[PDB]
């Protein structure tokens, strides 16, 4: 177990705690409390909950093989649920600001938060900042007396920082590094020389993999008091690997999955992003295809966007994706086997996370 | 002490630490390091440094009367400087996002960060988020082994949260509370019924007073290991009082101090903000002046803005400001006298902070 039901139930508790505290300590009025309730629901719910449920499933794995009083088992499961919501609220923060930064129109099948009629960008920027503050309010309330509090806060903040650095790498990925200058308007690259696997990998490593895979796996270990029982270098390597594959999927779906299924409308082509599709197309294309790509990439013009998507389709990128995927399967399986040496239970949790990631269709 | 020189010197050290870590741990390239260096300098420097120097001056007060080895004195002064930069970087974060939210054009005598040619709003939103992450990176690096670390992080996060709540109160201050609704476009108030002292005071309490006065005073106590030696209810009361007066000054200057001296261009009238000027004018005006105010407030139109400023000038608000100020002087002096009972040294630091605030011209 009922993991998803327990996790969703704890959302109601955290929300009530936060909103009750706003009334009792922060002098909030009922209508602004309602606004923040709706904001919380809209930005924190309706996703796949993969990050939060990873914390829960890692914790459940150790519960199955560790001797505990039932009260202790309930405490660990509750801590796992609260920690998972910390990551889901961190996600909510990033998506609110990212949708503004990327000029997006839909998220989770609804308008992006900033596009809601009674929201607008000026309030949505601050709403996003509130979401991140709530992660810390949660931590200090629910975990005040826990032995893992310091480790958890330190990990959370380093992951949050890495993600913000990665967002800088992402939103500057269509500029030439040598021309970056706050004082000079930034032209889009014309040579696309920095659309390389290594540079792509750096964006993804920081913007996605720490908070989507490393943070939930290690938080599950922390609330289980089990971190010392795994090889942390393997956790870092497998989180980076699965997290990169997760983003490659997201890049592919941005272009080729209908918004009806995906729940968002892709902007990577029009935004000139350094996506897996663009890097891989450039790793394959002949001279004429590169020049045609350059003539059309990074423009909102729906007909130029359409030229790019046809170039992608005719370049048979499904072949590159399959070879990349087959390589990731080898390496993920190898790392899971290595994890089994010290931590069979955690290895299985990583196998579950991989299976969920590998099979996802949104 | 040479307090200002020590404090500015520590900026260079923190900056080098942060940028060196970006190179050694976060795979940053030189041009993006340069961008973030310039971003740090532009957003963190050039203010009055009142918040950071409050930490230093509180710590210096206890140094003068406490027995310490010189090495311990140097450690406390360095911690005070690092903690002061934590608050200055928090300030930097708020100003970067606030200038976007308020549609402002100038800050500290230069263009707002988001208006720099090679910046733009999409990167500036994330740059602001980086500034806040840097406050935590600082804390965990410099204070990892300090006994005050947990208290400091908990205080910092609660203050940061209060400020974000206050920014919500601020950016929604021109809407009718009963009509707030994320799903419905928000009309500006027509009755201005929520332009009251009590509602004004709530905005200011949260958006300004916690991070501008409470946080620097208590951080000075924490790095001095002296918090138990003061009456914290008095610290809270005097921080709220001086912080409110500080914002009333800022509201007055928004309208009446030339940008050449102030270093920013006011937006409160055009933004329909609940400012001290608007609340006090409405506390004084006759029927015709209220209707003329309503006809002109909250519009970028330079001639409508000019109508409001003339209404302010003819309403003799200098009289209300002087009575308000005379009341604050009574109450601040009373709280300083009360603080002397347990903590003469801290009372004097608060007297210094008050004098600096009271005499400021920007
Ligand atoms: C890192 C990326 C690509 C952001 C979207 O993440 P998810 O696809 O996990 O979004 P939700 O399930 O939370 O909606
Ligand atoms: C949001 C973060 C931090 C990483 C994912 O970036 P994207 O910008 O690719 O995410 P989507 O908008 O595609 O979900
Ligand atoms: C709280 C307000 C009114 C923001 C500006 O603060 P300051 O007037 O202290 O700005 P700097 O000295 O840091 O430039
Ligand atoms: C920035 C914060 C959090 C409070 C001061 O608000 P203002 O919006 O009045 O500040 P200025 O732009 O006048 O400096
Ligand atoms: Mn996006
Ligand atoms: Mn993005
Ligand atoms: Mn995407
Ligand atoms: Mn402002
Ligand atoms: Mn403002
Ligand atoms: Mn102001």
To the nearest 10°, report the CA torsion of A268, A269, A274, A279.
130
Q: Do residues B320 and B284 touch, judged by C-beta distance below 8 A?
A: yes
How long is chain A? 362
Contacts of A44 (CB under 8 A, 6+ apart): A11, A85, A88, A89, A91, A92, A131
Looking at residue B188, the DSSP 8-state letter turns out to be B
Compute the distance between CA of residue A321 and CA of residue A336 in angstroms, rounded to an integer. Answer: 22
Q: Do residues A44 and A78 touch, judged by C-beta distance below 8 A?
A: no
**Which sequence spans correspond to the domains of chain B?**
1-362
Q: Which atom of ligand 1 is nearest to the CA of A208?
A: 1
Q: Do residues B7 and B81 touch, judged by C-beta distance below 8 A?
A: yes
The candidate with the shortest Cα–Cα distance to A223, out of A39, A120, A72, A347, is A72
Tokens (6 digits) for B245: 């007066």
Tokens (6 digits) for B71: 């090495």
Other beta carbons less than 10 A from residue A187's beta carbon? 11
What's the CA angle centered on A293, arms A291 and A184, to 5 degrees?
Answer: 90
A-chain CB neighbours of B134 within 8 Å are: 161
Using the beta-carbon criterion (under 8 Å), do A28 and B165 form an inter-chain contact? yes
Please provide the DSSP assignment of B123-178 as one string. Answer: HHHHHHHHHHHHHHHHHHHHHTT-TTHHHHHHHHHHHHHHHHHHHHHHHTTTB-GG
Tokens (6 digits) for A318: 């499904």
Looking at residue B285, the DSSP 8-state letter turns out to be -
Cβ–Cβ contact B105 with A under 8 A: no
What residues of B are designated binding site?
Answer: 98, 102, 170, 236, 250, 254, 268
B-chain CB neighbours of A172 within 8 Å are: 32, 123
Tokens (6 digits) for A161: 């920082």
Q: Do residues B113 and B42 touch, judged by C-beta distance below 8 A?
A: yes
Compute the distance between CA of residue A170 and CA of residue B121 in angstroms, rounded to an integer. Answer: 15
Looking at residue B189, the DSSP 8-state letter turns out to be P
- Quote the longest CA-to-CA distance of chain A: 68
B-proximal residues of A, 38-67, CB under 8 Å: 38-39, 42
Q: Nearest C-alpha of chain A: how many angstroms from B241? A: 17
What residues of B are designated binding site for Mg(2+)?
Answer: 98, 102, 170, 250, 254
Which residues partner with B107 through β-bridges?
B110
What residues of B are designated binding site for Mn(2+)?
Answer: 98, 102, 170, 250, 254
Residue A60 Cβ inside 6 Å of ligand 2? The answer reads no
Please provide the DSSP assignment of A5-58 as one string. Answer: HHHHHHHHHHHHHHHHHHHHHS---HHHHHHHHHHHHHHHSSS--HHHHHHHHH
Q: Do residues A272 and A190 touch, judged by C-beta distance below 8 A?
A: no
Three-class secondary structure of residue A128 per DSSP: helix
Determine how β-strand A110-111 pairs with β-strand B106-107: unpaired
Looking at residue B351, the DSSP 8-state letter turns out to be H
Three-class secondary structure of residue A270 per DSSP: coil
Q: Which atom of ligand 2 is nearest to the CA of A101?
A: 8
Tokens 């102030």, residue located: B262
Compute the distance between CA of residue A230 and CA of residue A214 in angstroms, rounded to an integer. Answer: 13
A123 closest CB neighbour out of B31, B34, B172: B172
Looking at residue B332, the DSSP 8-state letter turns out to be H
Compute the distance between CA of residue B189 and CA of residue B191 in angstroms, rounded to an integer. Answer: 6
Proximal ligand: closest to the CA of A252 = 7
Q: What is the resolution of this structure in A?
A: 1.9
Q: Do residues A48 and A213 touch, judged by C-beta distance below 8 A?
A: no
Compute the distance between CA of residue B88 and CA of residue B44 in angstroms, rounded to an integer. Answer: 6
Crossing angle for the helix pair B197-204 and B232-256, nearest 10 degrees? 110
B-chain CB neighbours of A153 within 8 Å are: 153
Please provide the DSSP assignment of A174-242 as one string. Answer: TB-GGG--TTS--PBPSS-TT-SHHHHHHHHIIIIIIIIIIHHHHHHHHHTT-GGGS-HHHHHHHHHHH
Contacts of A119 (CB under 8 A, 6+ apart): A39, A113, A127, B182
Q: Do residues A43 and A113 touch, judged by C-beta distance below 8 A?
A: yes
Using the beta-carbon criterion (under 8 Å), do A202 and B101 form an inter-chain contact? no
The candidate with the shortest Cα–Cα distance to A60, out of A8, A118, A4, is A4
User: Given ligand 1 and candidates A7, A43, A46, A47, which is best to mutate, with the most ligand atoms within 8 Å of its CB?
Assistant: A47
User: Is A13 annotated as contributing to ligand binding?
Assistant: no
A-chain CB neighbours of B203 within 8 Å are: none
Q: Do residues A310 and A269 touch, judged by C-beta distance below 8 A?
A: no
The helix (H) or strand (E) run that includes residue A110 is strand A110-111
Compute the distance between CA of residue B128 and CA of residue A93 in angstroms, rounded to an integer. Answer: 14
Tokens (6 digits) for A261: 């299924």
Other beta carbons less than 10 A from residue A11's beta carbon? 21
Compute the distance between CA of residue A96 and CA of residue A44 in angstroms, rounded to an integer. Answer: 10
Tokens (6 digits) for B22: 């970006």
Crossing angle for the helix pair A149-171 and A215-223, nearest 10 degrees? 180
CA of A203 to the centre of ligand 4 (A): 33
User: Is A254 annotated as contributing to ligand binding?
Assistant: yes
How long is chain B? 362
Using the beta-carbon criterion (under 8 Å), do A35 and B180 form an inter-chain contact? yes
Contacts of A14 (CB under 8 A, 6+ apart): A82, A85, A138
């Amino acid at each position: 177990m009922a993991s998803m039901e327990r996790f969703l139930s704890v959302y109601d508790e955290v929300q009530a705690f936060l909103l009750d505290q706003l009334q009792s300590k922060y002098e909030i009025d009922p209508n602004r409390a309602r606004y923040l309730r709706i904001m919380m629901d809209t930005t924190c719910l309706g996703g796949k909950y993969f990050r939060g449920m990873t914390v829960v499933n890692v914790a459940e794995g150790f519960l199955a093989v560790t001797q505990h009083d039932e009260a202790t088992k309930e405490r660990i499961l509750h801590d796992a649920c609260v920690g998972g919501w910390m990551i889901e609220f961190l996600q909510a923060h990033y998506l609110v600001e990212d949708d503004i930064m990327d000029g997006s129109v839909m998220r989770r099948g609804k308008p992006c938060w900033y596009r809601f009629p009674g929201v607008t960008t000026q309030c949505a920027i601050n709403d996003g900042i509130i979401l991140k503050s709530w992660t810390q309010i949660m931590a200090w309330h629910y975990f005040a007396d826990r032995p893992f509090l310091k480790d958890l806060l330190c990990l959370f903040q380093k992951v949050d920082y890495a993600t913000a650095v990665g967002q800088m790498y992402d939103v500057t990925s269509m500029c030439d590094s040598n021309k970056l200058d706050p004082e000079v308007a930034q032209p889009m690259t014309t040579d696309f020389a920095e659309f390389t696997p290594a540079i792509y990998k750096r964006i993804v490593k920081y913007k996605t993999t720490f908070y989507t895979y490393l943070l939930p796996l290690v938080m599950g270990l922390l609330v289980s008091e089990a971190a010392a029982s795994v090889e942390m270098n393997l956790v870092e390597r497998v989180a980076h690997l699965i997290g990169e594959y997760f983003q490659v999927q997201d890049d592919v779906m941005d272009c080729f999955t209908p918004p009806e299924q995906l729940g968002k409308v892709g902007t990577d082509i029009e935004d000139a992003k350094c996506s897996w599709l663009a890097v891989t197309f450039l790793g394959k294309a002949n001279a004429a295809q590169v020049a045609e790509f350059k003539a059309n990439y990074g423009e909102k013009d729906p007909a130029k966007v359409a030229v790019v998507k046809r170039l992608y389709s005719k370049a048979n990128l499904q072949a590159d994706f399959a070879a990349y995927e087959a390589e990731v399967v080898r390496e993920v399986e190898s790392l899971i086997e290595q994890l089994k040496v010290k931590s069979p239970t955690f290895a299985e949790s990583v196998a579950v996370v991989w299976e969920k990631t590998h099979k996802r269709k949104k």
